[model samples]
Target: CKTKDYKTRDVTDDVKSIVRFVQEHSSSQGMRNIKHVGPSGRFTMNMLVDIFLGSKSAKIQSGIFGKGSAYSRHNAERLFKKLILDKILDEDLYINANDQAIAYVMLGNKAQTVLNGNLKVDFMETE
Candidate 1:
């Protein structure tokens, strides 16, 4: 129930950091091939890079917060770390990577706070 501006202010930094990290990491990974197609039909930065890398054929499987989950921020972090360790993604991207990591933590913390009834934001009025 957050207002548009309130939500924007709250998530802007996180989203920006996420996007920046994606860009920097994508660049380092030599991800020149990018595409879009999925349930959301939204062309994600990673999806674009994946298609460009032509590694999409490999069908890398990943689990989320728990086993069997298709996607999880946790798994994403691990994958990114693996990429860095494997040198597929440059360590120089760590600046933005760390920003993204902190952003994720902040978002998770905010969500938990809301769940505990310690945080609340009103929704914007609609015409």
Candidate 2:
């Protein structure tokens, strides 16, 4: 099977800005369980966006692998649209209402690796 060649863009600054905005909003909304994965400066921007928009599961295993529930999808779309309209994210960066298939697949594989005990994820909590 031919695999699609997914292009990776260096949107590190963009992701950082978006994450800060999302974190502020999430904190305001009383969200406490937030996970950030940015190993070797390769940030999982999609997952950060998903969690901020409430499109991620509370459990790390569930969320890192599967996209959130249907309700989360709806909320994510609304939040995504708002961010686009507000110029928080470039229109070109907007791929779809939900997580892109490529990102979903990549993260899912990473989660599987973690589950296999070959990977270690450091858990940190904010006071």
Candidate 3:
């Protein structure tokens, strides 16, 4: 049987449906404003995912080993392992190499920006 589709239903589910639908898609728009913000936006999304997935090392919210922690070959390797095991980020997403290689690059970028004080660690969207 056919039923009437109310206009209210369309408007009410707009934001919620968009968020849920975006997550189902491969793109990261639903995650954070990475497209506009760049590296820091990526970092923000990573941290949020880590926290949601209960990443053990993310407990260090502040200090030298905290947010935007210093670069370390060891830490990058560890995070790669964790990301794979957690399955929040796919190993296949790396493209050319294994997940470890991608993690290394990501960590290095994070560390360099952190040290340079250019970390885009702000709440507002980038211009």
Candidate 4:
């Protein structure tokens, strides 16, 4: 099913809270400095994944085990893109040449512009 086929709710508030908490409490500074890598970067990414997964609605939870869960991937990607496009997140926060995983860094007042009313989240597949 397409992402639009599912009814999704705004998770701006949830995302904001996660970002704030990570910023204030997470010891890892993301990709702010060149020295940040390995354990620190992994820690930040893990924190983000944990927080995001924990905020999933029951409907979303149902599809967690399979590739049919388009909404979850769409939601996370959209949020990450918005954070990047708005300059609220560092573009080069994480880069592991040895691995396929990419890391990002949230910069400035990330919570402020994350869902600044103009964000348009559509889960329709684009060709």
Candidate 5:
């Protein structure tokens, strides 16, 4: 909801920068990492970052999941730890990852749309 290109306003440059980074990583050959590998195999961005399960589990364990709750702190601690430890590609980022063509086209379109909106080139003789 917050990250959408809207009817009122568009994306900020920094957000676009991050989006471009992800799009390049996802769209380009040999740079993609996250992908579907579960029971129902398919190619779609829907599978990326299944935060509900983890957040729900965190709720189950901590019982309070708010901005000031332990769930928030718990996730910050957990994710930040990964940021420090998982910098190496072979260590975690990549070694022989899935670069699905569907993902490439998906992110490719996303990057394009993020930068600008759709256009038309109608012919109008001026001679």
Candidate 6:
């Protein structure tokens, strides 16, 4: 039998999409002002979870229960970390964070040359 925790869900598309959504609605220059988001600001992984829970696609793409319904906060933290480790969320210079910022990869770690200022995405979110 499968254990209580089974890594069967795919969050790449969702994570990527949410990141895209935030990017589209954000006016910040980099990933700087988005660390602690709430009702406004840049955008963080936390917002990503809230958005994911409210999203229709998440209804069909989630765990046992739902995101916010289940152990969402904790689960989302791990989920976001997973995305970073997978290289889906790359770490780069926070254009406004004084280049002080944060991820992972087997590619032997990428250079911090690129700016995390902007992420190119096509997903849309209502303001």
Can you write out model 4's per-residue Cα lDDT over 1-127, one digit (the tens) per residue?
Answer: 3354555544444445545555565443343343233432233332344335544321111111122233354455565565566555555555568776665555555435554643333322321
Residue pairs with colliding backbones in model 1 are 1-122, 1-123, 33-52, 34-48, 34-52, 35-48
Candidate 5 C-alpha error for residue 3, in Å: 18
RMSD versus native structure for model 6: 12.2
Candidate 3 per-residue lDDT over residues 42-102, each given as its tens digit: 2233443343333443432221122222324344344434434433223433435444433
lDDT per residue for candidate 6 within 1-127, as digits (tens), equals 1245443444434544444544444343353332343343233454445545644322113122133343345466566555555545553324545674522111113212112423222222210
User: For candidate 5, what's the RMSD?
Assistant: 17.2
Q: How many residue pairs clash per model?
A: 6, 0, 0, 0, 0, 0
Error of 5 at 22 (Å): 2.6
* Worst ten in a row by lDDT for model 6: 105-114
Off by over 4 Å in 1: 1-69, 93-127
Q: Candidate 4 vs candidate 6: which has greater TM-score?
A: 4
The Cα local distance difference test for each model comes to 0.32, 0.35, 0.31, 0.44, 0.28, 0.39
Q: Name the 10 consecutive residues with the lowest summed lDDT in model 3.
A: 6-15
lDDT of 2 by residue, 56-95 (tens): 4422322222322322544444444443443443243334
Runs off by more than 4 Å, candidate 5: 1-8, 12-18, 26-43, 49-127
TM-score of 6: 0.38
Give the Cα error of residue 63 in candidate 6, in Å: 21
Which stretch of 10 consecutive residues in model 1 shows the poorest summed lDDT? 59-68
Query: Top TM-score: which candidate number?
Result: 4
- Which one wins on lDDT? 4
